[PDB]
Design a protein around this ligand. Structure first.
Ligand SMILES: [Zn+2]
Lengths: 23, 87, 97, 199, 127, 214, 100
RNA sequence: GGUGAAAUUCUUGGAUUUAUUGAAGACUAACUACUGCGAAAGCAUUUGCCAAGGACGUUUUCAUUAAUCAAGAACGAAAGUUAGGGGAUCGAAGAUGAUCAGAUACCGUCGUAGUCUUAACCAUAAACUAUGCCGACUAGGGAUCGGGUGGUGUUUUUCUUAUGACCCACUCGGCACCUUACGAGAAAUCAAAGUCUUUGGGUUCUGGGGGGAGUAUGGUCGCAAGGCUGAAACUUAAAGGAAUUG
């Protein structure tokens, strides 16, 4: 799909992995 | 060069936060730093209390800003009254 | 302009910088034209006008401070007043400035 | 001490005696020591000079303005503040004036005002950081600092106080027609909550 | 013989003024608009209202004592249109038909010598 | 039902005094109600009128002349030239395609303390024996034309005590001297004054205005 | 869609990206080159009379001026009746104006 | 007011409209074009300083000092980010009227941030002539913008003037056009997309069926937003360019 919704998928990839990794 | 960026505000250490420490750094550089004098010509140092500057090597004092000599809000008034003085 | 002609006095010509050396020259009737700065004080500026009109000498007011009058003469220091005794290839005595 | 404004002390002569009287002026940004100042109706329009509002054109800037004539100063004496002249009237000696909050006011034409913006501007910009900096500000003014929150207090000491959880309980918006003791909160509020842009 | 005034017509879209005044400009006589007479929202600017507005204006000034006028037409102006509306030139005839004299005419729409922004957006009124 | 139209006066406006006809129109004012005079709302008015009405010919039907009201001498209220201006439709006809136009602004004071802003339009001429379409002058030539337009206006004004200046301006004298002076640099055509605004003035001086009326 | 025209929006050539200008009808932003600039002169009195005003008026000759309104139209708006009308393949090439 | 028809509207204790002015912050119309200048992005009221710059003219000057360039640097629309000032108009968010089967969409009335600037940042666009620079050679045709030449040419007229401004021919450099293809091309079209199976003037960069994917991971750069770098497992026989009929 267009590269702002695909691109908004990196919000819930990065910031969710921040809770994961810093642990 | 010792510090990567912190500059003058490294005295506070790790306290108060990043956003406030940079906010202080912009103003605390100006008040401690030197001027270029209008009457004399010489340029060191000088500052003593908020508003009052300063004398280099001559002994004259000037009403300036809190953390700077030339306040830009007063500099435009210096030109505004210049225009109205003509008539 | 005045900045062009002052360069032509320095090379091939004579001049004395500073307040005391100006008064030494004005007393003896040597100076032909003195160049007073802007930021110089009024008490000093009024004195040189009175010294000049006795011996009858031109007093051109240089529009600009002492820091840029020093750069005009080709030096690395502030100057308040510049006399002109004998200009060689220059042409500032003939003109008004 | 304890004032956002550098003062200035000017020496005038006595017209009727061989003497000198010093007057304490608030220095506008532009003044310096060893400078002349011209105060009166016939005085000219420069930074520092004191003129009456009638002999001044529209769109000028002033400070230390008198409400009456003979008030000796009232309006716009704080740091980085200035009054702007808008209008004029021939019938009724009364100029139109805008105060630094926003609310305009009609002042008499013979009232005074010192020209220029008040010195020591940009004082509020720097943050205080450490609490000791805030202590030293109020140390040379009043005893108005370490303020405890009223909800944290007991129900005897303050209306909001009391309860198992720290809550107010009833509306903090209190009327104008109240009495002393009750008035703790927002007094005679038109709006509440977060305001957007325009004041 | 000839006492003059200024007729003034604001020929814009959706409205038509007829604003008669003296030579200086302050003292007015009549201000009968197109939308005052015909009451149906749509028919404020149309030629029907332009006739009826001018006839009422003619009856006012002839009772007072003003024979002729200087017509000075005005469009919406500024950033808007700069185009006279439907009931622009219908106002000029209705004064002549009634028997009120005319002299000197101009259009004085305020054309901005370099202007501020216009409405709609960058893509305009997409209908 | 008040009927305020019938409770009003009628007065005469007067021309001071370089124009041939010394009367214009018939303005009206409300009656002087107890303690409030009608003369307070008469002085300060501005009556803009055509120039051809003041003289006659349609050569001068190209302009607008304002008349600032001043005094009241037995209903004949007196005026004074407030400003000059070209009409709306008669200067846009001049700005044609395929030719450069020029303009120069001037600020000057007369012998009397009267500040006057004053402009001057000038277009480029199409020469005879031209195969070319355009007639554009270079930027170097126009800035020398803009020099000379300012000089001639600063010579005639500064001289002439306002009142005398209008008698020169009405019968296009200023337009001729710019044409002949600048033809060495560039031919030019039309050459007009456009506007003459009046910003500042001295004391009222009511009796000095009367010297015109006579 | 392949290459349609050579010049395209037209006169931006030996020149960077230029100033725009608003349309009359839509109030839409469009380049000043790609503008469709009609110049419409109109009589200030409508020609359906025209005598009726001048019969009752004062003065002889009479100026009777004209408004000088220059107009701009954002391409798609101009196809509604204005100076366009879609052309054929080889008819496109004619830069000479119709009539006169 | 505002609409195709409307409306919450705004107001009457003349709002709208008229005339005199005053303050504030914007943008520089018409003149404005198959014109100019700039390495690009981009630049349009007047005057004064400040240093740079292309072309042209030259029996001046030095005498290969040049071309293209990994690494590494300089600038770089609009939006956006911090922190100040400013804050008129239009205006994402958002309120709020209609239409509509629903409309939180297009239409309308307001409307925060933003739009302007001062110090920092960010480094991307259909940043498009979708055509990398330096060098030759090949075909005609008139216009135009800047110089430089010659014409007892025409005018300006203050008398010859002498400049200027026009005309006729010529010449270097520049933005572009027209007509033909003998050449080239898949063709639309192109005086360069020509001088290529008769293949070789010098040199930098990018690409190798479609998707997954400008994603994963690791570096590196930014306050952030995100840039620069950049895979595979696994899936599939087509995806696509230009033209002709209907
Ligand atoms: Zn449009």
């Amino acid at each position: 799909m267009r590269a702002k919704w695909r691109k908004k998928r990196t919000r819930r990839l990065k910031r969710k992995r921040r809770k994961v990794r810093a642990r | 060069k010792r510090t990567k960026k912190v500059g003058i505000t490294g005295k506070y250490g790790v306290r108060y936060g990043s956003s406030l420490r940079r906010q202080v750094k912009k103003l605390e550089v100006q008040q401690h730093a030197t001027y270029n004098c209008s009457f004399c010509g010489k340029t060191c140092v000088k500052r003593g209390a908020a508003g009052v500057w300063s004398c280099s090597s001559c002994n004259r004092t000037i009403a300036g800003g809190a953390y700077t000599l030339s306040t830009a809000a007063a500099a435009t008034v210096r030109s505004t009254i210049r225009r109205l003085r003509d008539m | 302009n005045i900045n062009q002609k002052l360069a032509l006095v320095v090379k091939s010509g004579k001049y004395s910088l500073g307040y005391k050396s100006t008064v030494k020259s004005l007393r003896q009737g040597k100076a032909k034209l003195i160049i007073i700065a802007a930021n110089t004080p009024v008490l000093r500026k009024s004195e040189l006008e009175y010294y000049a009109m006795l011996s009858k000498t031109k007093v051109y007011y240089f529009q600009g401070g002492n820091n840029e009058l020093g750069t005009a003469v080709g030096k690395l220091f502030r100057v308040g007043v510049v006399t002109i005794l004998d200009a060689g290839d220059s042409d500032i005595l003939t003109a008004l400035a | 001490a304890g004032r956002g404004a550098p003062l200035a002390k000017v020496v005038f002569r006595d017209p009727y005696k061989y003497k000198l009287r010093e007057e304490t002026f608030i220095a506008n940004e532009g003044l310096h020591t060893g400078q002349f100042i011209y105060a009166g109706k016939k005085a000219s329009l420069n930074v520092g000079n004191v003129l009456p509002l009638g002999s001044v054109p529209e769109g000028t800037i002033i400070s230390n303005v008198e409400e009456r004539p003979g008030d000796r100063g009232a309006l716009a004496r704080a740091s980085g503040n200035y009054v702007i002249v808008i209008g004029h009237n021939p019938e009724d000696n009364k100029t139109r004036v805008r105060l630094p909050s926003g609310a305009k006011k009609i002042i008499s034409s013979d009232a005074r005002g010192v020209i220029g913006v008040v010195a020591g501007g940009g004082r509020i910009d720097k943050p205080l950081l450490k609490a000791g900096r805030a202590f030293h500000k109020y140390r040379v003014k009043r005893n108005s600092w370490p303020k405890t929150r009223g909800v944290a207090m007991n129900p005897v000491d303050h209306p909001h106080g009391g309860g198992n959880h720290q809550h107010i309980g009833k509306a903090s918006t209190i009327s104008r027609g109240a009495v002393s003791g009750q008035k703790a909160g927002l007094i005679a509020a038109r709006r509440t909550g977060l305001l957007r842009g325009s004041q | 013989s000839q006492v003059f005034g200024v007729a003034r017509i604001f020929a814009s879209f959706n409205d038509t003024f007829v604003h008669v005044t003296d030579l200086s400009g302050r003292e007015t006589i009549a201000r009968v608009t197109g939308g005052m007479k015909v009451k149906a929202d749509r028919d404020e600017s149309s030629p029907y209202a332009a006739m009826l507005a001018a006839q009422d204006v003619a009856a006012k000034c002839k009772e007072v004592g003003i024979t002729a006028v200087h017509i000075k037409i005005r469009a919406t102006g500024g950033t808007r249109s700069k185009t006279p509306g439907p009931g622009g030139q219908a106002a000029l005839r209705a004064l002549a038909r009634s028997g009120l004299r005319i002299g000197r005419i101009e259009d004085v729409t305020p054309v901005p010598s370099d202007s501020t922004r216009k409405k709609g957006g960058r893509r305009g009124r997409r209908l | 039902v008040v009927d305020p139209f019938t409770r009003k006066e009628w007065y005469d406006i007067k021309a001071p005094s370089t124009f041939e006809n010394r009367n214009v129109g018939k303005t009206l004012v409300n009656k002087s109600v107890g303690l409030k005079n009608a003369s307070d709302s008469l002085k300060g008015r501005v009556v803009e009128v055509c120039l051809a009405d003041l003289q006659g010919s349609e050569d001068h039907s190209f302009r607008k002349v304002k008349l600032r009201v001043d005094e009241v001498q037995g209903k004949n209220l007196l005026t004074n030239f407030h400003g000059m201006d070209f009409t709306t439709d008669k200067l846009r006809s001049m700005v044609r395609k395929w030719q450069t136009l020029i303009e120069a602004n001037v600020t000057v004071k007369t012998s009397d303390d009267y500040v006057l802003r004053i402009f001057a339009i000038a277009f480029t001429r199409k020469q005879a024996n031209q195969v070319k379409r355009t007639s554009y002058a270079q930027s170097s030539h126009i800035r020398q034309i803009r020099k000379v337009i300012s000089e001639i206006l600063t010579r005639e004004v500064q001289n002439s005590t306002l009142a005398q200046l209008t008698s020169k301006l009405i019968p296009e004298v200023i337009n001729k001297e710019i044409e002949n002076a600048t033809k060495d640099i560039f031919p030019l055509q039309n050459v007009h004054i456009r506007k003459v605004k009046l910003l500042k003035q001295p004391k009222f001086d009511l009796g000095s205005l009367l010297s015109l009326h006579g | 869609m392949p290459k349609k025209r050579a010049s395209n929006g037209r006169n931006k050539k030996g020149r960077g990206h230029v100033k725009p200008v608003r349309c009359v009808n839509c109030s839409r932003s469009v380049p000043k080159d790609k503008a469709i600039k009609r110049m419409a002169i109109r009589n200030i009195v409508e020609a359906a009379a025209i005598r009726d005003l001048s019969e009752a008026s004062v003065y002889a000759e009479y100026a009777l001026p004209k408004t000088y309104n220059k107009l701009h139209y954002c391409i798609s708006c101009a196809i509604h009746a204005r100076i366009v009308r879609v052309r054929s393949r080889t008819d496109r090439r004619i830069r000479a104006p119709p009539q006169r």
